[PDB]
Amino acid sequence: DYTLTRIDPNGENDRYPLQKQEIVTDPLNVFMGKLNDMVNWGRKNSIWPYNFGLSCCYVEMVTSFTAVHDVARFGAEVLRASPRQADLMVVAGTCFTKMAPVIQRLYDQMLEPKWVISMGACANSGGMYDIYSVVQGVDKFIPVDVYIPGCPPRPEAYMQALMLLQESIGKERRPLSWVVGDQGVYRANMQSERERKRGERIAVTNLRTPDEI
Amino acid sequence: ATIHVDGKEYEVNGADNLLEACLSLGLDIPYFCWHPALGSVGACRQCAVKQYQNAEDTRGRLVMSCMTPASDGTFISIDDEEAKQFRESVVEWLMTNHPHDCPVCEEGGNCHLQDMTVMTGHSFRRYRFTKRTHRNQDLGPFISHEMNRCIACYRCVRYYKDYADGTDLGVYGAHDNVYFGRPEDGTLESEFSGNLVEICPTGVFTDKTHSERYNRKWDMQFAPSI
Amino acid sequence: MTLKELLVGFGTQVRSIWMIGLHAFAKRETRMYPEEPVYLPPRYRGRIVLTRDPDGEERCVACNLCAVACPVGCISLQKAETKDGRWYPEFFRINFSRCIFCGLCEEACPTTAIQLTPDFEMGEYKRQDLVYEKEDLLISGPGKYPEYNFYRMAGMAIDGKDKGEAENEAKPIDVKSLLP
Amino acid sequence: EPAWQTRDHLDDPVIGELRNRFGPDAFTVQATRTGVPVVWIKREQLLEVGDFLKKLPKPYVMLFDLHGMDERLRTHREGLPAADFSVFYHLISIDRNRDIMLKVALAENDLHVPTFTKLFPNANWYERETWDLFGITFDGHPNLRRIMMPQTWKGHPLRKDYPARATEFSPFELTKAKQDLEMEALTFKPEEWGMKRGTENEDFMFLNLGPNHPSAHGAFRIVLQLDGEEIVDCVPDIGYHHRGAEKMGERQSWHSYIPYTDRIEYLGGCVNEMPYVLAVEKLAGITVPDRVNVIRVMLSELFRINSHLLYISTFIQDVGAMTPVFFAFTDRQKIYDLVEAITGFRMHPAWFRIGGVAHDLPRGWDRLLREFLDWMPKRLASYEKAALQNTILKGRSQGVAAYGAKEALEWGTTGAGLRATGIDFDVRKARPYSGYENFDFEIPVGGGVSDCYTRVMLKVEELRQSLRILEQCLNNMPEGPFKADHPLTTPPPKERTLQHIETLITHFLQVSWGPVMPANESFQMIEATKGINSYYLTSDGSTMSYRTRVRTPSFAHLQQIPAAIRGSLVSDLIVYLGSIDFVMSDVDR
């Protein structure tokens, strides 16, 4: 229940992303597993987002940074202006066709490990902008770890996606060093949130009427 | 022939009625009972326009454009206030008994009655009493029958009996209980019964074969074919 | 700069430091998601559901008005019919990776079947899972509108509601009736 | 006579002046619902007419808008000159409080117009966009290159034969060759803009200030030619936020386009919805009731306070003080409490309708409005004392990127910059709309210099005035309908839709095929959060817009940037970008 990705920027593959993915089994012993868990804990509790925004979704993400939401509580407020110091790229906005090589370049300039959250309907699929100048989803060329529906997602939806990314990071397998060992990145194939929440969602019967505050 | 419509001069065929002449010019007059292939009968009273004998006439008189020849020198107004109010009143009278059926009606989005309700500008209901209802008939595998939606425009019987020479469709009953259908349940025997689904301006006669896998007209991908 | 400008600037710097240091004694403004739940007002436009009438049947008559009213085109459904003749969606899928939560489908719904509900937590790992079929949309109650039944108003006959049994409907009169 | 009635505006004195100067056969007056005299002039007389309007006794000083239109599919062109394409020029006389729209007809083969850049220097970017999207050449333009699309783009997307949807073309496939090609095309070429690489003593550093820069307000690049830290020249590179919103206007029904209007200026919300619904209501012949006017004004002022809070806090953050943005976003959350309760959404409510608003006000809205009106003023006074009266902020902003009334007028600058130059021009007072004349509020004006500091403090005073308007909205809220009684009110009131058949029919057709707007041209200008925002709508008689032209103020302000910042330090440009009040959705549409 793991997908292994191996990157190959100079291989015989031109289409982005320059990577290959294969469904494998969990590679994980009594000490390497514990130290991998410690590295995953440290990485998931210190996620520095890239100060990068395309449209209105960025306004909601930085709203989550402020005092009324305080995403600092999760340890994810540091907000680096440099791609080298950033761990998380939030595609917060429309992937405009003119902006797509820029997004690819900025993703290339980030360093390992890196995660991608596609925030909002535009970044997810193109959203309402099925139009000549808009790429229909940033996952046409960027591998995406978490998708947030919404236009915009509210700041707590961005926080919920941050927690989802934390659970995905906490059970991933990455090279502990670049000198010795397997260097491919193993990501757990999680149960979908739709299937997880289906039981409590279908059981809803009555909601408040839209007539009061 | 030269006619005047709302102060605009037009060249028309004098052998045509005013409704077909004005529709050929691109003007919008609401209509139900007239059809180009069936002729005019003046039943639905929807196509009212105000007529003036001279240019220096301001009183006028409401006439049926489908029943009025488009002769030389006629003055008419479509956008007259009394004409617009009467056409809206005709739509409202048709709406008094019409069922609340558009979401579950196969004619929706393709319905001439919907279009003429919108075209006259009638959107407020003030009738508060009961709506008459009808049972339906089984008309065979091709045509589905829903008489609640009938506006009694007589198009079906005029097409089926006068045009197509069919014998098993007719109009029964009287005043506001007029029923359009067969004398009993059974398959419509005309080889051209299927044209009723386009002839009927409402969802009384609908395509049952399409109704099995129904979609609306806007969702359809069309092509010209043979 | 002048001496007065220097003294005034020193005073303004001192004032700024003092006011932020007094903010250190203030009540916190943070709404602590997720430990305290987000309050959403009742008409908040979040996750879309399909609802049921008070009799327990699904309200959706598969009229396709929501799909055409959607400016994104992220609703796809197909009409089907039961034996008694009621219309219902054979399938109903919503692409939530596309949906902008504008609420135009709920506004266009003539049966109050489709409703936007106060729920914003729909983040996913794979965006193919953001395609919600009818099994993930149809809830077990009326949702925001507790009493409306479209079929109680429609003239079309279904099971348990014959001709003449809808609201504001008279009983059908046969053309063979003896009364004039 | 209702305000939406078709008028030719022959009683406007500018028509008589043009008739006396050029003759009665030199131009054709078109009757519209734009509220503005629309005059078709010959292409050979365009510069003469523009010069004559520039030198009138009470002159037309601002080129408000300049764009094109593809008339080849327009079936209702009665009384109009024969045109395959056309270019329109919206000019404003502030001292007359009047405006005129000149129109030039063009044949398909001869798609060239004389450039307007000598008369109005802000015509440069408008002509670049008209060339980019329509393929209309402007002769004598100093640099007529693409501005919305990349340089390696084929075709002109606003043409009627260009496909709108991305799914018409192949899905986006980023390859190595394509990435190298578009990254080469994005690379700045200083020889194409008349810049040298340096002097003999030193080299100029060409710096990308964006698209990914903390001070660029979105997808936006300025290429700075730097001598040390001095800006020798700059080229603002826009079009990175181009969403095809006008093309989408030709692609959605009149009702289903409203959420797109929300995302034109994404900090504006209902403010962005207001000119579109007013222009559609002019097309539909709808006069909304008083309660609708007050509801729309209240939502507009709430979103104006929201946008101004973000603007003031981000200016303070750009100057260097990072604390007030936390508190200001808390204030934005108080506004969002009210806005979520009323509309069901935070950022893009999509809540205005043709003929009214989507729902009535929920029970208990006045409690939330009263809470915000009690919360706001102490917070604003705290921001003023802690940050805006700090002398380091004043030394960063006072006297920085300054321009006067002449520079504001020649670049189309509106909003706080224009009123900071001393010109008292606000749309809500000069051309009142939506019942704004029933509210008492002041329009703050500057002393004559449009500073960074003056623009920010003018927006602070505008925030206080919007608080006054909201107090009046809370205290005097009319009882009545939230939707007009017109047949074209889209959608109709929902309860009548759910129980009345004719209302159900109207709703059915309005949400599916769309409301039918009779063929006309309409225009609505409003005071948006960042300046003057306008919608120019052409109906061809269908359920879709034939042409949706959105004039946004941020386009003009970003074009003004190199004239006002040339010869300054980079820090001055950072403060200038913070004080313009722009978002790039507004710039690129």
Ligand SMILES: CCCCCCCCCCC1=C(C)C(=O)C(OC)=C(OC)C1=O
């Ligand atoms: C970091 C602590 C919380 C403050 C949040 C940042 C302040 C608001 C962001 C302003 C902004 C906007 C709107 C913006 O659109 C933009 O472009 C993406 C920026 O540059 C990175 C911005 O800085």
Ligand code: SF4
């Ligand atoms: S998804 Fe909506 S809110 Fe987010 S960038 Fe797109 S238009 Fe803006």
Ligand code: SF4
């Ligand atoms: S016949 Fe027309 S108006 Fe009547 S229910 Fe069907 S679609 Fe509606």
Ligand code: SF4
């Ligand atoms: S069944 Fe149809 S065609 Fe016949 S009278 Fe009724 S509405 Fe007209």
Ligand code: SF4
């Ligand atoms: S909320 Fe808007 S975008 Fe989402 S399914 Fe409904 S109509 Fe479509």
Ligand code: SF4
């Ligand atoms: S508009 Fe309502 S009843 Fe019609 S198909 Fe959509 S959810 Fe079903």
Ligand code: FES
């Ligand atoms: S169409 Fe003329 S009366 Fe029916």
